[PDB]
Amino acid sequence: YPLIGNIDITFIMPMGVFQANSMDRYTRHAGDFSTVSEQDPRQFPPQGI
Amino acid sequence: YPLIGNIDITFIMPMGVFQANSMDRYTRHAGDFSTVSEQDPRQFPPQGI
Amino acid sequence: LFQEAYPPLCSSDAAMLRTAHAGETGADEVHLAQYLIRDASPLRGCLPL
Amino acid sequence: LFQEAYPPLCSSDAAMLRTAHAGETGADEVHLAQYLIRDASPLRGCLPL
């Protein structure tokens, strides 16, 4: 049956984008996502999406 | 009387899962579940469900 | 026939299984290394707690 | 025909992609160096999560 036609939508995502601006690397609160490590494993550049 | 039939639903829970990735062991706040011990007894690997 | 099993409301800790509101139960996913699996069974609005 | 691509709900962190309230997902856009790109596709209220 026609009117059961298909559409196509494309999706785009970046993967390894590091926010180079030191002002752009900000957290909305102090203790947002804390850990037990002395260095938080979120200041490191991302490697995946 | 029929139409009072039974069903069978199976449940699954993991027991000794330790989140091996160090980036996954996050707390959403600083004082979420505080204690008096100098070592927090929640960073240890779980042993029950 | 689908070869599946539904996870119930389970947690690795009894502390995060209930909240302090005289009402609904806890819903936080992972605290430090413990975990709470939200109810995904068909028994969502049944089986009172 | 417009030569464009709609970004879907993607994040560089699995922690920030879901919030702990038994309901809606997360909304924080950048925590330390990770990011959450909110949905801009025509599937805003569709494709259940």
Short synopsis of the structure:
This is part of a larger assembly, with four copies of chain A (49 residues). The first copy, chain A, has 49 residues and is low in regular secondary structure. Helix content of chain A is 0%, strand content 0%.
Could you tell me how far the N terminus lies from the C terminus of chain A, measured between alpha carbons in angstroms?
39 Å
Radius of gyration of chain A: 20 Å
Shape verdict of chain A = elongated
Structural class by SSE content of chain A: little secondary structure
What oligomerization state is this entry in?
part of a larger assembly
- Count of individual beta strands of chain A: 0
Q: For the report, how would you describe the main beta sheet of chain A?
A: none
Strand residue content of chain A: under 5%
- Helix proportion of chain A: under 10%
The most extensive interface between chains reads: A-D, 24 and 21 residues
Task: Report the total helices of chain A.
Answer: 0
Protein name (chains A, B): Major capsid protein
Organism (chains A, B): Human herpesvirus 3
